[PDB]
Amino acid sequence: EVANPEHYIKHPLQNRWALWFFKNDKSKTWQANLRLISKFDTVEDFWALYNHIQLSSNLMPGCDYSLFKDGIEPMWEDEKNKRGGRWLITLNKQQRRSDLDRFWLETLLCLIGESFDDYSDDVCGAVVNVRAKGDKIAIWTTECENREAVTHIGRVYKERLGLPPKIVIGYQSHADTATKSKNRFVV
Numbered sequence: 015e016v017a018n019p020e021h022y023i024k025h026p027l028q029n030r031w032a033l034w035f036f037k038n039d040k041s042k043t044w045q046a047n048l049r050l051i052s053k054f055d056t057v058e059d060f061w062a063l064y065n066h067i068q069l070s071s072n073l074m075p076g077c078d079y080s081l082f083k084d085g086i087e088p089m090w091e092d093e094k095n096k097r098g099g100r101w102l103i104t105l106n107k108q109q110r111r112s113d114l115d116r117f118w119l120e121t122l123l124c125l126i127g128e129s130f131d132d133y134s135d136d137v138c139g140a141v142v143n144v145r146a147k148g149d150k151i152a153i154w155t156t157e158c159e160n161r162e163a164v165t166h167i168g169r170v171y172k173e174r175l176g177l178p179p180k181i182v183i184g185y186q187s188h189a190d191t192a193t194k195s196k197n198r199f200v201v
């Protein structure tokens with residue numbers, strides 16, 4: 015005697031996600047600048063958020079977005095990131111105009127739609143940095159010594175983003191980033 019779910023239920027996502035924002039303030043500690051915007055666990059709710067926030071290309075330089083699974087904080091020191099690393103896409107000044115927004119939207123959809131299939135549990139999140147010197151986008155994974163997981167994710171990422179074979183992307187452990195400056199893997 016009941017209604018048909020398809021007609022009126024929001025479409026759940028595999029995971030709940032947290033969207034964070036960062037504004038540089040020089041007088042403050044790094045960690046103090048990282049504020050949580052909101053969380054969502056449906057398709058409908060993702061788009062309400064995406065649709066009401068500024069596109070990455072219109073942020074002041076020194077601002078960032080990040081999307082992490084609920085319960086994983088967007089920093090190396092989190093339990094689920096500390097042994098991890100990221101696949102880094104360094105864009106140039108010209109690509110802010112032509113790729114920044116589409117690569118980030120693509121990255122958002124890779125996360126929420128679990129595009130990494132059997133390895134979607136190694137994915138922690140992603141970070142788009144808006145920077146005068148070059149914009150960066152990266153996907154964070156949980157364990158940098160899981161060769162098969164890491165490289166699979168890289169290969170799917172590169173392909174979902176449409177990057178040609180001649181553009182090489184690197185994977186670096188957060189441990190190295192935190193204490194040096196070195197690619198563990200390329201793709």
Ligand SMILES: Nc1nc2c(c(=O)[nH]1)[n+](CCOc1ccc(Cl)cc1)cn2[C@@H]1O[C@H](COP(=O)(O)O)[C@@H](O)[C@H]1O
Binds near residue numbers: 044079088141143
């Ligand atoms: N303790 C500590 N510090 C960090 C961390 C960290 O995870 N844990 N992250 C990495 C996380 O970034 C985020 C930025 C914006 C958001 Cl929405 C979420 C994460 C950067 N930092 C600090 O930023 C500096 C410049 O960073 P980058 O050139 O990479 O921008 C970096 O050298 C370091 O001092």
